[PDB]
Each structure stands twice: as structure tokens, then as C-alpha cells.
Amino acid sequence: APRAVQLYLKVGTNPALEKAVQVVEQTRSHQLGVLVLDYVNEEKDGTTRDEFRFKLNIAMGQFAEAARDALEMARFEQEEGNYRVAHDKLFGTVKQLEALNTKPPGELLRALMLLHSYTLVKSLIAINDHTTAARMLVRVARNISKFPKHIVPILTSTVIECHRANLKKTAFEYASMLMRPEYRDQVAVKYKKKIELMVRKPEKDPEELEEPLADCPFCNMPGPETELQCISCQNILPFDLATGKRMVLSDWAECPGCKFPASASQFIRIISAEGRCPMCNDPVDLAHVRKVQDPLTKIKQQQAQQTNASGGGAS
């Protein structure tokens, strides 16, 4: 180990580095991490070393850190338009760490929601789910921290959707925060004068097409769709890829290619509209989408999902 695979790194390749990592996995020692991990993070650039001490954190048995590893490569590819692969990497470490007695905490899950709150819109912008597309755009423009590339597209698509989805009240209060001439001019100048007219004067026809509000899994309160919080039980509510809704207590279903919160009443629609899960990029169809008919399974599954990110892991 400490001299052997240091010789293996003295010769030195990307396969040599990842196999020295696997020798840390064999040895389960961080003094090999003095001779492999140190080599990894003081000899390699931030892309290949990222997966190197991802699987080395698998070696060293730290999985808050490995969750941060795939979180950081995913947020590297989040701010470039490749956020589908970013969602793939975030939930890839979710299942990797769930196979390693851990999982990423709620912060990687909220990065997953920041990504999903702009990803799902493009799957709802043309299926006449314009209401939830515009609302979920409002959600991604609310908690925006990991799409500084998409924030100008996020706000542009949000204001044009809420103009064209009968969400003219949030279109009005987004046009109110479009008084910045940077964001008043990304839309057309005619729409800029329309914005000035509808804000300076009272808004012409304010309206909202609300989302089909679902209910909490734990203690059953019908909260808003896009906020995923069990405020009936003060827990984190499971994350619907279906339409970004809450856990319906009659149409609970998993994400069957990847075993995640879904809701087949709208998850069947979203899989039909996408042809596959837009979160592991794995082929899932309607017959693959299998309903789990007991929402108490998701009650205990969300309790486990909140109460499995704390462990150390396979060390």
C-alpha cells in the first residue's frame, strides 16, 4: 500500500490513480490517503481528481464528503447548460451512497430541486401544463443559487410563461422586479413598455392559474405543490418528479428506474412526455412506472431518507 501504490503513482496514470484509490478501498487506511489521496488532490486537476476522491471517500468511508464530491462536479456542470448530467451525478451519488450505508443530505437534495425546478419546466412548457411550468419557474427563480448561467433564461422564460399561462399576477410582480433595465430589455422593447404601463398603472388583468395542490404524506395537509416540505410534520417532503407536487395519498409511485419519490397521476404523464426518467437518463416507460399503493411505505421511506444521510458509511 503506502510504498507499493505510491510506486504505482510514481509511474502514474489515471487508471493508476483510480486503482491506487481502489487499493485504499482494499486497505481502508488514510495513511494510504497520505500516499494516494495526497497524490490525487495535489497532482490532478479538479475533474478527474473529483471522481478520484469520490471513490476514495468510498475508500475512506466518508460520504458527506463523497456527496459533496458529486455535488461539486454536478454544480460544475449545472452552470453550463449540462444540468441533466448534473442531476444524473447528484442522484448517482444518492444511489451510490445509499448502497454505501449513507446518502447525500438535504442540501444535495435541494440542489437537486434547484436543478429540477428549471428542468421540469421544459417538460411542462408545451404539454399544456403551462400553469405548473410557470409556477415552477417562479420556484427556480425563488431559490436561485446554482444556475447563474440560466438565471437570465430562468427569468425570461418565467415572465413570458406567466404572461402566456394565465399567471398574470406573478407575471405582474415579476414585471415589477423587471424594472432593472438589464432585465427589462431581455424581453422586447414593446414588452418593456407594456411592463412599464402595467406596473406604473394598475396591472391589466391580473390572474393566476394555480397548481393542482397536493397533500402532505405524513399528517396530510394540502400544501402548495412546488414547496416540498412536510409542514404538517415539520419534515422534508418527498420530491416529485411527477409535476413537482406533494405526496398524493392515493397515487404514490416510485421513480422505478431509480427508486425515488414520484406520483404516477402526474409521473405517468411526465414519463410519457419525456420517454425516460430525466434524472438518471435511464429508459423508463409507463409499464416501467409501477405504483406503490401504500403511502405509508413512502412515510417510512421519507423518514429513512431523512434518517440515513448521517452515517459514516463503508469505511
Automatic annotation (TrEMBL):
It comes from the Eukaryota. It is found in: Cell projection, Cilium. This is Intraflagellar transport protein 144. The lineage of its organism: Eukaryota, Viridiplantae, Chlorophyta, core chlorophytes, Chlorophyceae. The gene is IFT144. The chain holds residues 1053 to 1367 of 1367 of the full protein.
